[PDB]
Symmetry: C5
Amino acid sequence: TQPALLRLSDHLLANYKKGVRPVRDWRKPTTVSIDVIMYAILNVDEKNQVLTTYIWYRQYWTDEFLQWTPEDFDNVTKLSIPTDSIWVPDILINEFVDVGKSPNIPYVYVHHRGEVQNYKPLQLVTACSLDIYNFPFDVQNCSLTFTSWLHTIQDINITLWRSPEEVRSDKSIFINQGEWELLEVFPQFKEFSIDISNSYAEMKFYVIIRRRPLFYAVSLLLPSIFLMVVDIVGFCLPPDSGERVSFKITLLLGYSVFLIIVSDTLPATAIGTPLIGVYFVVCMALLVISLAETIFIVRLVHKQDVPDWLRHLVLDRIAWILLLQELSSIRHFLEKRDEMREVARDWLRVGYVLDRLLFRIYLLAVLAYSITLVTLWSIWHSS
Amino acid sequence: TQPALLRLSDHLLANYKKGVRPVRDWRKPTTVSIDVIMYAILNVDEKNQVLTTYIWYRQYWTDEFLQWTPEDFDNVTKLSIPTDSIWVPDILINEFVDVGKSPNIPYVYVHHRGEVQNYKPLQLVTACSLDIYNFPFDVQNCSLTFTSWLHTIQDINITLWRSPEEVRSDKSIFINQGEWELLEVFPQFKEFSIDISNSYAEMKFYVIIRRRPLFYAVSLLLPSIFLMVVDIVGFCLPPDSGERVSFKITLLLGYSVFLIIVSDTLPATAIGTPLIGVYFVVCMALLVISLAETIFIVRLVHKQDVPDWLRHLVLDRIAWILLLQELSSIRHFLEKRDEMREVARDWLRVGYVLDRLLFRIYLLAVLAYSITLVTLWSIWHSS
Amino acid sequence: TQPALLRLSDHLLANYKKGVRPVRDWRKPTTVSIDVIMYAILNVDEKNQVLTTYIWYRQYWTDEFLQWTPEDFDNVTKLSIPTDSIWVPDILINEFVDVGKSPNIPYVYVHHRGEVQNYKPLQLVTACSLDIYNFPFDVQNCSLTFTSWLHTIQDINITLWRSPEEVRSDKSIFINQGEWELLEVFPQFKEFSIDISNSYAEMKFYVIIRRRPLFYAVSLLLPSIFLMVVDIVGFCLPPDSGERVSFKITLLLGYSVFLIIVSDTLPATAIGTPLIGVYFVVCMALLVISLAETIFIVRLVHKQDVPDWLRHLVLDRIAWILLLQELSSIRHFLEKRDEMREVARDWLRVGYVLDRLLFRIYLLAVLAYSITLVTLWSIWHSS
Amino acid sequence: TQPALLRLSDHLLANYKKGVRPVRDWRKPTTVSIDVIMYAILNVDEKNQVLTTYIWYRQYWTDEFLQWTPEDFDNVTKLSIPTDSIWVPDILINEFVDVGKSPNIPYVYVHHRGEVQNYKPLQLVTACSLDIYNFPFDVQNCSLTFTSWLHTIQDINITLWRSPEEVRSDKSIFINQGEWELLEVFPQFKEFSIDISNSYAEMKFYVIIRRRPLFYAVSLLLPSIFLMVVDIVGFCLPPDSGERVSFKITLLLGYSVFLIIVSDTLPATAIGTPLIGVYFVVCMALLVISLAETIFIVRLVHKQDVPDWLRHLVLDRIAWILLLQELSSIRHFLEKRDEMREVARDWLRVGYVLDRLLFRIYLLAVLAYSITLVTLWSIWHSS
Amino acid sequence: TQPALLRLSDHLLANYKKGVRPVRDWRKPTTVSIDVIMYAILNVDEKNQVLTTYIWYRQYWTDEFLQWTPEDFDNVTKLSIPTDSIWVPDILINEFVDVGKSPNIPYVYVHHRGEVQNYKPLQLVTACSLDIYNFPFDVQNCSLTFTSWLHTIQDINITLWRSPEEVRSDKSIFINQGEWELLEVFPQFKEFSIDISNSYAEMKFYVIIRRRPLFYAVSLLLPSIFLMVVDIVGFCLPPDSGERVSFKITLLLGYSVFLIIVSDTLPATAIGTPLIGVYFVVCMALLVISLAETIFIVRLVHKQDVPDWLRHLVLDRIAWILLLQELSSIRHFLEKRDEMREVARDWLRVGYVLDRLLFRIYLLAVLAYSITLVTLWSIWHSS
């Protein structure tokens, strides 16, 4: 006598058709459960609005023809079969824009009551809407819809194998060391008809993820905050100090390089914009502004007199704030060291006033930036 | 009795030939409808003049041999068949320079009157002429011609399944969050003969898209406009102020870095050129120009006298604008502080005049830039 | 008479089934030994937390049906068979997120007692937790779990072919010239059940590797240490020396560029952070700090008097440290060269004190950096 | 009666052998015409010396066995056959280092007299010698040899389908918007024998292309020419003007960044070198040279006297060009303002002479650069 | 009568087995000659220690079953057969870490005495030890071992087809325009046993290559040498000249950018280091050193007196080298212009001495660099 593992495999696979749906009455569908686990988050391309994941996609369904009596064959109740030798459902992710590179599992299991169990390490790449407004603290609701491309609901009703609560909690297999965390995955059924009789079963999986903003924080914000503080203290100087002006130039160069670094190297998609680079743009803007202002005042150090305009403007401004003759050749030579103050000094002083006012409001800008930052931190920690 | 889903699949696919065109009289073609939907715009490579899209290409055609009487088989009127087990038309996009990575749909449908329904998530990559003249506000008319590579019109007449108006309006499935929008897709039939009897049916699809210039605007133009304004105000200074000249040097460094950033990081193909970097090149040019001019004047501060040439030139210029002796040792020591003005001052003043004239016209250049910008905005919003 | 190499190949492969597990009694598993060698470490992507290796994966198992009597066939005891013509186990690496590009070995060996010997140059790509805390001196414990995706332990018990000590020592085939070294590979068996009756055999291989930090050392740290030393010596200067302040600006630019270079070009994942760039951030921070301080003092050179606050603060500070009249016009003109010291000098001196205190503690920071460096060196050499 | 399209396909493909060369007398070859069209120039990698093209490769040959009498079968004279069901020639491009990604055309045509017509959108990647001497204006003669890898001339004689003049003129299908133009494609037959009896037919296709140097011109040369002009005018200054020297430093920084940008971002292979970056290297060199010279002179401003050496050298140089006592304390204090000229002035003047001589010859260098540029333009326009 | 090309192909391929080794007595191996030609050197990745080549791998071996009598079949002595229809040896390159993309040759030849001739354009990618010590002038001995992965020497003895001298000289087919040259390829047989009875034939091919250092020379060294010379001449200045110090800062910025460019853009693996960047690191180091020294001296310009320490140190140093009263108010006001020299001058002079000593030894460093360079040139030209 032969092995029953041969005799049964000879029985079940002979006179079988991989194309014909495995059912005796066509009017019934062949229902298909699934189960999804997130092994890891391989990569997140914020620019192209796509996602890279690796999952352990299980699958279960029934085949009327893959049935036997265990007692007739060695009391056997399971059997390995090649997946390519039987009918298989053409499940497909709606967001699957590009083919996933993953190895084909050459076998499946079968039970003595038509059941089938196909597991595989499905790797996938999908599209997703990615918000960059909270760029370090970004949290997403990327989706994974599961369905047949063609087979209607009347042939294939997608279902779930595990219970949904069990699915959301399941973090049995995950690599936390990645840049991106994972919070849960909510499954939900849906029916989908673009037009009549095109009913298609569906099973959405609201994948949720959270970024670890530590690295971005230390790498980006703290250098920016140091730049902010050096601008803050640089404004303390008196305007026509020349290398006060060159110091604002130094800060301009640093801010320029950093602002450049943002979309040089850091992810910044075209849709929307993050507020962080916005605030940095603003601070650089105010820097160059008062760079021009102290330069204006430096021109005004040279005797130059528009003081009427200036004067009523500062009034409204602060309203809104609410032989011996020859040895006196040498005397005059001395006092000419600062005799030009009689014109230079009014404009010098009011320029100093501008410097300090502008300094206060720039400080307020940096304050708003920090407030926003702490708000985003709290929101990130909120879930 | 067996299942009719088996008995009919056994009937239809036995004694079938995938190669032979599915028709009884060869003189007739096998007409093929299609339908096209734009799931998304994955990427746009402005440099290589190509496009990346993901579409839901449907397809319909008739097969004389895939016919049956429903009553003979379980009153059945539909059936799933493997796509690889029957004749298929070799439709192919003319612009399809590189193979699209997309998964093969292993099944199709068939009706009891020879009809076939093949749907698939065809991903594709094509060439396209891309205008960069309106770089942020670029709007394109990229095409997708559909045809058989070989089969003549006498075997295969391409058609359309839906009506064209329905097709242009259809944005049922699209992801607006991408960098690129989508306006519509115009279908149109065409016949194509390079030479006689090589008639080939065709079906063009004038894909239309629109960029969201917000990110590029904030990231590029506003920094550039701030650079423009600091140059504007820097020109207010008097020429031989030394760090006026160093300030123009600072602006030169910033403009250099930015102009470099343009084709460093921002898309800029070799065909044509965008006007934005053009205007920036111009403003940098005028900056370095008057950097040289104030330097020229600084040399002229040193006593140096070509004032005849200068003098008739400024005339035509403004025409076109239309013991006690020893204590006077110390007196002369004092007045020698500015006795050199007798030569320095004429050249100093006319240099100041150059600075201000050049400042006005540079302002006009920046004005033209802004006018152009608003024009492009209006054109972008026009459709 | 024909060749026996033909007659036996005709005997063994006819009436064979690639799908059926090669066994006579299903209740027994088909045990599978393995053996692993590390040809090379192709690449290590610290960012994406993955690994690239090339290995010589051997494999051994038994087939009850691939049995013969050597005497009946030319006294033959070995035979080459195509691997695609027989049953094969579906071994698969758990961390195998992306398919390895490797060539298929078209043949195997078989012995006259059911034994099989399949060797292949399996290339693979896996995930791994990668610590960057000791960025140059990083040492990892990346893993390679081996198992069947589906087949339970009751069908397939993974084992080892060689002995484990022999395996760990084996560096017969390895390329030491790569960036990454290799220390050993520890094999270990494991059983794995997510839930009941889902027992799956496993065989982990704790791959160990060590970086050669020479290049990173010379390329990164020594330039940084030179930057550190120039800041050290720059602090020796007196505060209101103007280009002392510009020298700190120079160092700020250099430090900025280098700190930028770190995550520009050098690997720096998002999880955790290396201490090296941390220390560099700190030194840059102290530089910009005292840049602001000497600037503050430069403002204070201008007559300005907050000296009460300063004075009790420095007290607590050092507690914690524990006609002739007209020719005297010219006399006063002379002595006015430094008559402003009466106010400038106290603030100047205490600013000098700040410079030197801050210099000492910055020196201590650089000291801690060097201590850490030597510690990591010793740890690296420790194994 | 069945369809003749079935009956003939049943006749022709039964008892056919895809491997056997389709011929009755082996002594004759099976001649093969071709035809080549350039759809587009996808990319040109100047570094790796390769080329990316997309072509419409037609092909024609005879099959003695694929013959029928039209009258016997529906008066039919054409027929679609799957390409994979018949003999095909193994044509292969000699420069085809890397496999072209292109879709397989699943059908061909056949006529009733053994003729076959296979068209396909062959995409390819080849090697090519690429001259960068005229980097913007580069024009190439990249080749595409066509042949069988194995089949000798005695089995396969390559030929041409169209006439060669028709082929060179044909630009029916081409996309001019690419960076690269196309001028023509010259076909030519060749016989090729490395050694005796290894005669192999061949069909070379001298693809010709021309770059559109507009973008490179505006993006590279004009900024460089502006740099040139600012150096030109900067040399007008007198040497020991300090920020003359700092201005040459500014230009040095700009030139450095640009020279870096060249092989940073612009294509520059290792074989040979373009003259454009050469000229830029030269101008930067002369800048740093006279930067050192004005620095030398600045040291010489300090009293320092080598004037004998200098003096005979300038001779040969220009040969080759072919109480009251106390109020005179204050008098001497005044005249000491420039009493150091008695030594500073000779060296100052001769340094000025060096500045101007060096300025003239640097101007000549820039002149040569421009002359070369116009020459290359004319050559580019020449064909 | 049929064609003999059909009748013989029908004879030879019927009753054939692709798996069984083509031999009548198993005790003999099936010996396999080869031949190798280097079409081109596609790419060399110095970082990953790999190589990219394109070769024309021929192959020859015998098949006992593919034998016929020419006279019985049209006096035929050659025949084209599909390669996939017969036994083939599983030759494989030991260094073949990643699969080569190359097209499959669908045919082979066969002669009437069992001989087979398979040619193919094998493309490959391998690992190789790459020395970067002579980075521009690097010359390698990269290897290509050929063998069967499995089949022992007792089944397959690798051999060579051509003679070895003929093989080393053969440069019939090569593209010299690439970055990399080729000198020769030495073939050599080897036997290989990790352990007993695992004898495996082998055929190593010591590929040799040489870089064309022209581009790297002009692009890297000459700018570096110009930097060296400007530092050389900058050291001529007197120390407390302020923009001497700023000039060393300029050179520091340039050197920094260049040193950064090295491993930014130029290949620099982690194993070992090139001496060129080493020398550049050294010169930058000495620059920043004496930048600090002139800064030290500038502090010492301020009256400051450690001159005892300095004095005995310079001794050992050079040992190792082996009313009227009021008008004298104005007199003293004058002479106070340099009365501070009484302390400033000793320290100033000895600082000048340091500058010049350090200048000499830095010159020596640059000298050593140039000597090394010429040495490497000579070595490169040596073969």
